[PDB]
Amino acid sequence: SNTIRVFLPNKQRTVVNVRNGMSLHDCLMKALKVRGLQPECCAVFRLLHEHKGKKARLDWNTDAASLIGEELQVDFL
Amino acid sequence: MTEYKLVVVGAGGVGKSALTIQLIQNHFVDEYDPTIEDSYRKQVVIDGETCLLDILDTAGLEEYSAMRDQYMRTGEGFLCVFAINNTKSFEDIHQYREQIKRVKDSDDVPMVLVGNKCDLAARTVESRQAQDLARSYGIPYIETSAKTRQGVEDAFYTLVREIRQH
Ligand SMILES: Nc1nc2c(ncn2[C@@H]2O[C@H](COP(=O)(O)OP(=O)(O)NP(=O)(O)O)[C@@H](O)[C@H]2O)c(=O)[nH]1
Ligand SMILES: [Mg+2]
């Protein structure tokens, strides 16, 4: 752990384990496709832990292997 | 309306991450993916009533036995999931109930038992062998198989009925 606590819409959550070489669109499929929500029409945030409430948007083609020990947030567009 | 909280407790190798999945997305999952803390939600209509199932499956690996005593006083109903092909999972039911009772004190906890993987033939744990155990706790016993959609709906339905008793 080596984990990233990702919060999904509809007041849901999921923590995933990330191996090196994996982005944020490949290792987030089965952990999101099993809820009906399509990644194409869903955003992505990284909850800043210095303000608590103001997150920053990112790109789905980001290596999530570097965000070990963080905490994300997914929103619907 | 009322929001039912279904906490799924069970060991490793069983079919927790296949039951909770095949209810929301109706899909069976092979690939053993070590879960840690995943929550689910679905707008269902149980007994002529459009309800809501905020499911939360837990980890069977005892490397996360710290936040157990956090959502087990949150969840309204529990769900002990094992497989009749795994004996060790059957022997760890006693160490679940006593650890669930430890949290919310009461002995009248809305629960129901699920013997997953009934589509195999590696049954070392019979029905009555599990019924006589489930009788002691006073909760029913349902036999499922998350590979063939058997008893899947009855798992997250009969459990709600137990919440609709207290
Ligand atoms: N034959 C059969 N195999 C099943 C069934 N349900 C789950 N499995 C198998 O059980 C294995 C583990 O599945 P999984 O649901 O991830 O188990 P788990 O209880 O979630 N593991 P963990 O507790 O560590 O999260 C997989 O190989 C899967 O194919 C079932 O109904 N039949
Ligand atoms: Mg699991």
PDB file of all heavy atoms in Angstrom, chain A residues 19, chain B residues 10-17 29-35 59-61 86 117:
ATOM      1  N   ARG A  19       0.416  -0.941  -9.660  1.00  0.00           N
ATOM      2  CA  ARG A  19       1.754  -1.411  -9.998  1.00  0.00           C
ATOM      3  C   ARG A  19       2.416  -0.428 -10.960  1.00  0.00           C
ATOM      4  O   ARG A  19       1.731   0.318 -11.659  1.00  0.00           O
ATOM      5  CB  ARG A  19       1.689  -2.806 -10.622  1.00  0.00           C
ATOM      6  CG  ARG A  19       1.111  -3.874  -9.705  1.00  0.00           C
ATOM      7  CD  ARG A  19       1.044  -5.228 -10.402  1.00  0.00           C
ATOM      8  NE  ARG A  19       0.566  -6.283  -9.511  1.00  0.00           N
ATOM      9  CZ  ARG A  19       0.396  -7.550  -9.877  1.00  0.00           C
ATOM     10  NH1 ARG A  19       0.662  -7.926 -11.121  1.00  0.00           N
ATOM     11  NH2 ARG A  19      -0.041  -8.442  -8.999  1.00  0.00           N
TER      12      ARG A  19
ATOM     13  N   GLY B  10     -16.332 -11.689   5.075  1.00  0.00           N
ATOM     14  CA  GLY B  10     -15.953 -13.005   4.590  1.00  0.00           C
ATOM     15  C   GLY B  10     -14.450 -13.149   4.459  1.00  0.00           C
ATOM     16  O   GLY B  10     -13.718 -12.166   4.534  1.00  0.00           O
ATOM     17  N   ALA B  11     -13.989 -14.380   4.256  1.00  0.00           N
ATOM     18  CA  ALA B  11     -12.558 -14.664   4.165  1.00  0.00           C
ATOM     19  C   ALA B  11     -12.007 -14.389   2.770  1.00  0.00           C
ATOM     20  O   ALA B  11     -12.610 -13.654   1.990  1.00  0.00           O
ATOM     21  CB  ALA B  11     -12.276 -16.102   4.572  1.00  0.00           C
ATOM     22  N   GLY B  12     -10.856 -14.979   2.463  1.00  0.00           N
ATOM     23  CA  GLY B  12     -10.228 -14.786   1.170  1.00  0.00           C
ATOM     24  C   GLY B  12     -10.351 -16.000   0.270  1.00  0.00           C
ATOM     25  O   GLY B  12     -10.358 -17.134   0.746  1.00  0.00           O
ATOM     26  N   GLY B  13     -10.451 -15.761  -1.034  1.00  0.00           N
ATOM     27  CA  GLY B  13     -10.573 -16.839  -1.999  1.00  0.00           C
ATOM     28  C   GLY B  13     -12.014 -17.195  -2.307  1.00  0.00           C
ATOM     29  O   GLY B  13     -12.293 -17.878  -3.294  1.00  0.00           O
ATOM     30  N   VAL B  14     -12.930 -16.732  -1.462  1.00  0.00           N
ATOM     31  CA  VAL B  14     -14.352 -17.016  -1.633  1.00  0.00           C
ATOM     32  C   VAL B  14     -14.963 -16.222  -2.784  1.00  0.00           C
ATOM     33  O   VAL B  14     -14.309 -15.979  -3.797  1.00  0.00           O
ATOM     34  CB  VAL B  14     -15.149 -16.740  -0.343  1.00  0.00           C
ATOM     35  CG1 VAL B  14     -15.005 -17.893   0.630  1.00  0.00           C
ATOM     36  CG2 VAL B  14     -14.696 -15.443   0.296  1.00  0.00           C
ATOM     37  N   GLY B  15     -16.218 -15.817  -2.625  1.00  0.00           N
ATOM     38  CA  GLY B  15     -16.926 -15.126  -3.685  1.00  0.00           C
ATOM     39  C   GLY B  15     -17.624 -13.848  -3.263  1.00  0.00           C
ATOM     40  O   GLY B  15     -18.746 -13.582  -3.693  1.00  0.00           O
ATOM     41  N   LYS B  16     -16.967 -13.051  -2.427  1.00  0.00           N
ATOM     42  CA  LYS B  16     -17.512 -11.756  -2.037  1.00  0.00           C
ATOM     43  C   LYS B  16     -17.472 -10.787  -3.211  1.00  0.00           C
ATOM     44  O   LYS B  16     -18.467 -10.127  -3.517  1.00  0.00           O
ATOM     45  CB  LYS B  16     -16.733 -11.169  -0.864  1.00  0.00           C
ATOM     46  CG  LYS B  16     -16.870 -11.940   0.430  1.00  0.00           C
ATOM     47  CD  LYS B  16     -16.216 -11.186   1.571  1.00  0.00           C
ATOM     48  CE  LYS B  16     -14.809 -10.741   1.210  1.00  0.00           C
ATOM     49  NZ  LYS B  16     -13.927 -11.880   0.829  1.00  0.00           N
ATOM     50  N   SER B  17     -16.318 -10.708  -3.866  1.00  0.00           N
ATOM     51  CA  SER B  17     -16.150  -9.821  -5.008  1.00  0.00           C
ATOM     52  C   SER B  17     -16.649 -10.490  -6.285  1.00  0.00           C
ATOM     53  O   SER B  17     -15.960 -10.508  -7.305  1.00  0.00           O
ATOM     54  CB  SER B  17     -14.686  -9.407  -5.150  1.00  0.00           C
ATOM     55  OG  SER B  17     -14.209  -8.853  -3.939  1.00  0.00           O
ATOM     56  N   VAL B  29     -17.133 -12.457 -11.956  1.00  0.00           N
ATOM     57  CA  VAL B  29     -15.724 -12.087 -12.020  1.00  0.00           C
ATOM     58  C   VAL B  29     -14.793 -13.224 -11.603  1.00  0.00           C
ATOM     59  O   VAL B  29     -14.874 -13.724 -10.482  1.00  0.00           O
ATOM     60  CB  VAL B  29     -15.435 -10.846 -11.155  1.00  0.00           C
ATOM     61  CG1 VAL B  29     -13.944 -10.554 -11.131  1.00  0.00           C
ATOM     62  CG2 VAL B  29     -16.208  -9.647 -11.676  1.00  0.00           C
ATOM     63  N   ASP B  30     -13.914 -13.630 -12.515  1.00  0.00           N
ATOM     64  CA  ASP B  30     -12.880 -14.605 -12.197  1.00  0.00           C
ATOM     65  C   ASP B  30     -11.780 -13.910 -11.407  1.00  0.00           C
ATOM     66  O   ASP B  30     -11.971 -13.573 -10.241  1.00  0.00           O
ATOM     67  CB  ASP B  30     -12.292 -15.211 -13.473  1.00  0.00           C
ATOM     68  CG  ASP B  30     -13.354 -15.607 -14.472  1.00  0.00           C
ATOM     69  OD1 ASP B  30     -14.388 -14.911 -14.542  1.00  0.00           O
ATOM     70  OD2 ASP B  30     -13.155 -16.605 -15.194  1.00  0.00           O
ATOM     71  N   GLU B  31     -10.640 -13.714 -12.071  1.00  0.00           N
ATOM     72  CA  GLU B  31      -9.484 -12.937 -11.593  1.00  0.00           C
ATOM     73  C   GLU B  31      -9.476 -12.491 -10.129  1.00  0.00           C
ATOM     74  O   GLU B  31     -10.158 -11.539  -9.754  1.00  0.00           O
ATOM     75  CB  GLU B  31      -9.259 -11.728 -12.510  1.00  0.00           C
ATOM     76  CG  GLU B  31     -10.522 -10.933 -12.812  1.00  0.00           C
ATOM     77  CD  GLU B  31     -10.288  -9.809 -13.797  1.00  0.00           C
ATOM     78  OE1 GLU B  31      -9.167  -9.717 -14.341  1.00  0.00           O
ATOM     79  OE2 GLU B  31     -11.226  -9.018 -14.027  1.00  0.00           O
ATOM     80  N   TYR B  32      -8.691 -13.184  -9.311  1.00  0.00           N
ATOM     81  CA  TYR B  32      -8.592 -12.867  -7.892  1.00  0.00           C
ATOM     82  C   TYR B  32      -7.937 -11.505  -7.692  1.00  0.00           C
ATOM     83  O   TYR B  32      -6.716 -11.376  -7.763  1.00  0.00           O
ATOM     84  CB  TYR B  32      -7.796 -13.953  -7.163  1.00  0.00           C
ATOM     85  CG  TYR B  32      -8.013 -14.011  -5.664  1.00  0.00           C
ATOM     86  CD1 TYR B  32      -7.712 -15.160  -4.951  1.00  0.00           C
ATOM     87  CD2 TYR B  32      -8.514 -12.921  -4.964  1.00  0.00           C
ATOM     88  CE1 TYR B  32      -7.902 -15.223  -3.587  1.00  0.00           C
ATOM     89  CE2 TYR B  32      -8.706 -12.976  -3.601  1.00  0.00           C
ATOM     90  CZ  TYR B  32      -8.401 -14.128  -2.917  1.00  0.00           C
ATOM     91  OH  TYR B  32      -8.594 -14.184  -1.559  1.00  0.00           O
ATOM     92  N   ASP B  33      -8.757 -10.493  -7.434  1.00  0.00           N
ATOM     93  CA  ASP B  33      -8.249  -9.159  -7.146  1.00  0.00           C
ATOM     94  C   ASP B  33      -8.407  -8.838  -5.666  1.00  0.00           C
ATOM     95  O   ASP B  33      -9.520  -8.612  -5.192  1.00  0.00           O
ATOM     96  CB  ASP B  33      -8.960  -8.111  -8.003  1.00  0.00           C
ATOM     97  CG  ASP B  33      -8.689  -8.293  -9.480  1.00  0.00           C
ATOM     98  OD1 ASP B  33      -7.636  -8.872  -9.821  1.00  0.00           O
ATOM     99  OD2 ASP B  33      -9.528  -7.861 -10.297  1.00  0.00           O
ATOM    100  N   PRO B  34      -7.285  -8.834  -4.929  1.00  0.00           N
ATOM    101  CA  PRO B  34      -7.264  -8.531  -3.495  1.00  0.00           C
ATOM    102  C   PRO B  34      -7.931  -7.196  -3.183  1.00  0.00           C
ATOM    103  O   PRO B  34      -7.310  -6.146  -3.347  1.00  0.00           O
ATOM    104  CB  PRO B  34      -5.766  -8.453  -3.184  1.00  0.00           C
ATOM    105  CG  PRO B  34      -5.128  -9.338  -4.196  1.00  0.00           C
ATOM    106  CD  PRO B  34      -5.942  -9.163  -5.445  1.00  0.00           C
ATOM    107  N   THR B  35      -9.184  -7.242  -2.741  1.00  0.00           N
ATOM    108  CA  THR B  35      -9.910  -6.032  -2.370  1.00  0.00           C
ATOM    109  C   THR B  35      -9.459  -5.523  -1.010  1.00  0.00           C
ATOM    110  O   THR B  35      -8.894  -6.272  -0.213  1.00  0.00           O
ATOM    111  CB  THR B  35     -11.438  -6.259  -2.347  1.00  0.00           C
ATOM    112  OG1 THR B  35     -11.750  -7.380  -1.511  1.00  0.00           O
ATOM    113  CG2 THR B  35     -11.963  -6.518  -3.750  1.00  0.00           C
ATOM    114  N   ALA B  59     -12.242  -6.779   3.359  1.00  0.00           N
ATOM    115  CA  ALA B  59     -11.105  -7.632   3.025  1.00  0.00           C
ATOM    116  C   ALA B  59     -11.042  -8.860   3.928  1.00  0.00           C
ATOM    117  O   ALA B  59     -11.197  -8.756   5.147  1.00  0.00           O
ATOM    118  CB  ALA B  59      -9.808  -6.845   3.107  1.00  0.00           C
ATOM    119  N   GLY B  60     -10.811 -10.020   3.321  1.00  0.00           N
ATOM    120  CA  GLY B  60     -10.713 -11.265   4.062  1.00  0.00           C
ATOM    121  C   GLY B  60      -9.311 -11.517   4.578  1.00  0.00           C
ATOM    122  O   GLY B  60      -9.096 -12.387   5.421  1.00  0.00           O
ATOM    123  N   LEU B  61      -8.356 -10.749   4.066  1.00  0.00           N
ATOM    124  CA  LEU B  61      -6.972 -10.853   4.504  1.00  0.00           C
ATOM    125  C   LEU B  61      -6.764 -10.018   5.765  1.00  0.00           C
ATOM    126  O   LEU B  61      -7.063  -8.825   5.780  1.00  0.00           O
ATOM    127  CB  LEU B  61      -6.032 -10.389   3.390  1.00  0.00           C
ATOM    128  CG  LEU B  61      -6.230 -11.061   2.030  1.00  0.00           C
ATOM    129  CD1 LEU B  61      -5.265 -10.503   0.994  1.00  0.00           C
ATOM    130  CD2 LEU B  61      -6.078 -12.569   2.146  1.00  0.00           C
ATOM    131  N   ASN B  86     -14.398 -24.400   0.754  1.00  0.00           N
ATOM    132  CA  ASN B  86     -13.346 -23.986   1.672  1.00  0.00           C
ATOM    133  C   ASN B  86     -13.776 -24.197   3.118  1.00  0.00           C
ATOM    134  O   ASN B  86     -14.753 -23.606   3.575  1.00  0.00           O
ATOM    135  CB  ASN B  86     -12.979 -22.520   1.443  1.00  0.00           C
ATOM    136  CG  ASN B  86     -11.732 -22.107   2.199  1.00  0.00           C
ATOM    137  OD1 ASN B  86     -10.902 -22.943   2.554  1.00  0.00           O
ATOM    138  ND2 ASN B  86     -11.589 -20.811   2.444  1.00  0.00           N
ATOM    139  N   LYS B 117     -20.412 -20.532  -4.193  1.00  0.00           N
ATOM    140  CA  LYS B 117     -19.778 -21.558  -5.024  1.00  0.00           C
ATOM    141  C   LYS B 117     -20.444 -22.932  -4.917  1.00  0.00           C
ATOM    142  O   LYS B 117     -19.762 -23.945  -4.769  1.00  0.00           O
ATOM    143  CB  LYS B 117     -18.275 -21.666  -4.727  1.00  0.00           C
ATOM    144  CG  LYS B 117     -17.498 -20.358  -4.862  1.00  0.00           C
ATOM    145  CD  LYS B 117     -16.000 -20.610  -4.739  1.00  0.00           C
ATOM    146  CE  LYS B 117     -15.192 -19.323  -4.769  1.00  0.00           C
ATOM    147  NZ  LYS B 117     -13.729 -19.610  -4.805  1.00  0.00           N
TER     148      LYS B 117
END
